[PDB]
Structure formats: C-alpha cells, structure tokens
C-alpha cells in the first residue's frame, strides 16, 4: 500500500557546513518563514492537498508568512517537496504603524520598510 | 418559416364595452349581501364544474358520476377509457413514487 510517510529525525540534524552553505546563523534560529507553493497538489495524496490548504498556500508563487514554531514545522515537513521556504529578514527592523503603507517584500526574502521615498 | 407579407387589420378592442365594464361586479355578493348567496352561484358553466376544481382524473370521475347517464355512447365509452388510462398512469407511473 501507498501510505503516509515517516521521516526519520536524522534528516533534520543539520551538518556544520550547511550553516555556511544556506546562510543561516549557527547560534540563533530565524523567527519567520516565507513559504511559497512551487509545485501542484494535483497527482498528490489528499492529505498533502489539505495541508497545502491549511497553510494558506492555495495559490502558486505567492509568498505567505508562518511562525517557525514546531506546530507549523510539522505540516511544512509533510509538504516540503511542494514548497520553497526562505527565512524572512528585517534589515530595517519590524514595521511601525507609520510604515504600514510603504512596506514591500523583496525576492531575496527581505522586508523593506521604506519603499520609494520621493 | 415564411411570415405573412401584409399587415393584419388592426383589431380595436374597446375596453368599455358592456361585458368588460361590468366585470366582476357581484363577486362580493356574500360579504356585502349578508351572506345568502355564495359567489359560487355566479359561476356559469358545465353542471359538474360549478364551484369545484380537480386534476383531470378527478374531473372525469366526477363528470361520469354526475352526467354519465345522459351521455352519448361514444362519449361515455371514451370517458371510461380515459378514466382507466388516467388511473393507471397516476397510480402506477411517475418519477416520485
């Protein structure tokens, strides 16, 4: 039978080189995910279709942001072949309430707070 | 699909002719008339249909009961066959059961 699939935890123990490679900090995990749906749910099992629905990933090539907490990481782990995950970065820091209109999200995965001054 | 080539004579109906102007006059005869005559009495028509209504089966059944013995042969026979057909149809055929 084709079934769901366990994914042994050894997969998710990162090697020391990986930090260098994908550009994460060995010390501090990132706070937020940018998830994008790269592939299609057609031809995939219903349970993956549902996960993709409940992550707000319905529409392709649209970014969506999620907490980096384990509860979410479980679902992302299930559908990880359908998606692209990139850590959200805040060079200018979090937006205040004056900056809400001017926010924009750049493809390198970083959120710029002041967009197009004069 | 050819359509007539000439304008028909325009038919003028005057709405104020007697029958149209007086229409539905005594319909309230019961209420205003201290009930004596029910509006049924105003119905002109076949004896079995005055102040009564029903689907075709009920209609035929009733016609036969009332005027059946005054009917012509061919018409009575036709009426019977009609009844048998309607009986069979309504009772044994349909979608909804």
């Amino acid at each position: 039978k084709f079934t769901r699939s366990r994914i042994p935890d050894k997969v998710f123990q990162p090697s020391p080189e990986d930090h260098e490679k994908y550009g994460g900090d060995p010390q501090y995990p990132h706070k937020l995910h940018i998830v994008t749906r790269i592939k299609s749910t057609k031809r995939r099992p219903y349970w993956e279709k549902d996960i993709i629905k409940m992550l707000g990933l319905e529409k392709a090539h649209t970014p969506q942001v999620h907490k980096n907490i384990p509860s979410v990481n479980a679902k992302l782990k299930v559908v990880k072949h359908l998606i692209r995950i990139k850590p959200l970065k805040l060079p200018q820091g979090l937006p205040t309430e004056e900056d809400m209109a001017n926010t924009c999200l750049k493809s390198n995965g970083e959120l710029v707070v002041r967009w197009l001054l004069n | 699909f050819h359509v007539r080539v000439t304008l028909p004579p325009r038919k003028v109906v005057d709405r104020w002719n007697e029958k149209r102007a007086m229409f539905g006059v005594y319909d309230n005869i019961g209420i205003l008339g201290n009930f004596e005559k029910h509006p049924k009495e105003l119905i002109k028509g076949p004896i079995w249909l005055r102040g009564w209504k029903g689907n075709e089966l009920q209609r035929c059944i009733r016609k036969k009961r009332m005027v059946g013995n005054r009917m012509f042969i061919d018409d009575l026979h036709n009426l019977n066959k009609r009844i048998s057909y309607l009986y069979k149809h309504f009772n044994r055929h349909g979608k909804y059961r």
Binding site: - | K53, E56, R59, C60, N78, R82
Partner: protein
C-alpha cells in the same frame, strides 16, 4: 384579490383529442420488421400527421378557489383606502340629478376634474333615482352599481369612485363587522344570536 376575481370564475372549454379519441388507426400500419422503415402502432399516434395530441388541453377545466373571507374583506377596505388617499374618492349625498341628459353628467365630471371613468355606488337597486339610471344607461365610462356590487376589480378599472352617503354608512358597518367576529360555527345564512 384582483387576480382571484379574475380567475375564480373562469372555465376553459378547450379540448384536444388524445390519440385514443381520434377516428381510426386501430391497426399496425405495416409489419414490425423487414419493411425497412420506422416502426409504428396506430397511424393516429402523436407523431403522425393527423394524429392525436400528446398533451394538450383536456376537458372543460375549472380554475376555482376561494380566498378566505377576511382576506377579501381586507381587499375591499384597502381598495377604498387607496381610492381615498389618492384623492379619487368622492362622497356624494343624494344622487338626485337635475336632468336625464347624459351630457350633463359628462360635463360635470369635466368641471370637477374627475377623470375619464367614474363608478357610482348607490345603496339599493330599486331605489336608484330615475334621472341617474337614464343618464348612466347610455354612457360607456360611467357605471352605476348597487352597494352589494362593489368590488376590487371595478374600483381599479374606474379612475374615480363616487359613494352615496347611506352607502358609506352601509359599507363601514358590513366591513367592520369582521374584525370582531367569531369563526362561523355553521353558515351565516342560518340563525345566529345577534346576527341577521
């Protein structure tokens, strides 16, 4: 109520012959197989030219139903109300006319701006003054009618309503009687305690 007035009287005599009532064609027009053509029973089937009608109207048909009393009463009340609110109701005394010339009536309605058509309601049939009967018998748009003949359809057909004064006293009572009334035990034509 207008719809009720229109339909409840109606009896359609329209009939069409089912394949059973057409004149002939008890026999199979040709043999079921081998002839090379389409198969048929009677030549009177609804497919065939002279044949019977598949559904079509059936028999004299009655459309008859009764709007419940209190509704038809409400109907009359509303018709009067609306005639009044729109300025087209005129309570008249009398009905005594100075003369039997209908032209008098026409020009009278022209002087008071009464509109094209007028419905004149009087208390009883025999008690109608003769001048009015004369005048209104030769008129198309003016219509004289007894109180028991008042109805929604006629009131909406004529632009202006003209009520005699005793007529108002009559209608008022007859119509109001229903707000306070019990449901009938047996028909109201029979003896009741207070009721005629």
């Amino acid at each position: 109520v207008a719809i009720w007035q229109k339909n409840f009287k109606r009896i359609s005599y329209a009939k069409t012959k089912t394949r059973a009532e057409v004149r002939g064609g008890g026999r199979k027009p040709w043999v079921q197989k081998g002839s090379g053509r389409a198969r048929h029973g009677s030549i009177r089937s609804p497919i065939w030219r002279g044949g019977g009608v598949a559904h079509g109207p059936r028999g004299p048909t009655s459309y008859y139903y009764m709007l419940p009393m209190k509704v038809r009463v409400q109907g009359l009340k509303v018709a009067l109300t609306v005639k009044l609110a729109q300025d087209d109701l005129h309570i008249v005394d009398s009905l005594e006319l100075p003369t039997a010339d209908p032209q008098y009536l026409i020009e009278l309605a022209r002087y008071r701006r009464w509109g094209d058509s007028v419905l004149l309601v009087d208390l009883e049939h025999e008690d109608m003054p003769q001048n009015v009967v004369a005048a209104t018998s030769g008129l198309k748009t003016f219509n004289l009618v007894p109180a028991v003949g008042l109805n929604v359809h006629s009131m909406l057909k004529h632009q202006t309503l003209v009520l005699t004064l005793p007529t108002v006293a009559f209608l008022e009572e007859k119509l109001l009687w229903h707000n306070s009334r019990y449901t009938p035990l047996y028909p109201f034509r029979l003896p009741y305690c207070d009721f005629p």
